[PDB]
């Protein structure tokens, strides 16, 4: 049985995220002293981050671009810092380098989008306010602030090449936790559809099946249930604290009853 509709259910949040608060920030915290800005209880179109002016690097490692719309996260962490042009590649899972091993290392299983753009018109002097560590005996733990002298100041100059040019880099750390999600983006929560094989997409909980009324006695902090086979069976709606059963769309085998072709060609299907 093919899906017949496409349901969308996101919490009662309509305010725009302070995306420009950290994306359009006047000052970015140094890469070795990067700030972690937590964004929550808001909805914002990630396309404006995809197609913002003067943007050169918008890659989602562990996410698919334009798929963030249908995915709501409990909390989104905005890590704002400025690095060299050649150092943007180091802000990614599995990458090694000066920034990736001295100042700011992402987890090897990073689930987020690394956003960078050239800022030679704003962060160029040598701009001796941005600093990056240059020496360390080992590699940094993921999301750690570490504070010749290892802490070497950036030589950010307008005459410097695009490799040495200052680039403002923002990291969106998405945490898909079992708690209800709030950073939902541009999603018009559709009507709750019952007795129809529909695609769930409950705050990004991708799936398909039949949604009916549920009688489980959920605890207040629990958002969804599970079966003995570790299969999702019930989901609580983010807006109203109502739980709904999940039944997969019916299927089966098809067999044909036929007599000998030498007699006739009438068939029956079961």
């Amino acid at each position: 049985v093919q899906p017949t509709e496409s349901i969308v259910r996101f919490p009662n949040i309509t305010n725009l995220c302070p995306f420009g608060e950290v994306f359009n920030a006047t000052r970015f915290a140094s890469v070795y002293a990067w700030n972690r800005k937590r964004i929550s209880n808001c909805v914002a179109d990630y396309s404006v981050l995809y197609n913002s002016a003067s943007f050169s690097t918008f890659k989602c490692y562990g996410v698919s671009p334009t798929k963030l719309n249908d995915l709501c996260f409990t909390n989104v962490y905005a890590d704002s810092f400025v690095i060299r042009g050649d150092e943007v590649r180091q802000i990614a899972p599995g990458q090694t380098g000066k920034i990736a091993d001295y100042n700011y290392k992402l987890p090897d299983d990073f689930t987020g989008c690394v956003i960078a753009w050239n800022s030679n018109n704003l962060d160029s002097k040598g701009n001796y306010n941005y600093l990056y560590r240059l020496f360390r005996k080992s590699n940094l733990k993921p999301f750690e602030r570490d504070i010749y002298f290892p802490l070497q100041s950036y030589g950010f100059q307008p005459t410097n090449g695009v490799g040495y040019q200052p680039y403002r880099v923002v990291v969106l750390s998405f945490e898909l936790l079992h708690a209800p999600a709030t950073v939902c983006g541009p999603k018009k929560s559709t009507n709750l559809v019952k007795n129809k094989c529909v695609n769930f997409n409950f705050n990004g909980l991708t799936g398909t099946g039949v949604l009916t009324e549920s009688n489980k006695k959920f605890l207040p902090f629990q958002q969804f249930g599970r079966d003995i086979a570790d299969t999702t069976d019930a989901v609580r709606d983010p807006q109203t604290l109502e739980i709904l059963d999940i039944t997969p769309c019916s299927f089966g085998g098809v067999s044909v009853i036929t007599p000998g072709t030498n007699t006739s060609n009438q068939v029956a299907v079961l």
């Binding site: 079966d227 086979a229 299969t231 997969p248 299927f251």
Partner: peptide
């Protein structure tokens, strides 16, 4: 068989059937 039950089993058959123990997508 006893002609007084929905299933025309015997007493022994009923006992044997009762003495046995009691996803998919």
């Amino acid at each position: 068989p006893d002609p007084s039950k929905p299933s025309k089993r015997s007493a022994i058959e009923d006992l044997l059937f009762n003495k046995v123990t009691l996803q998919k997508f």
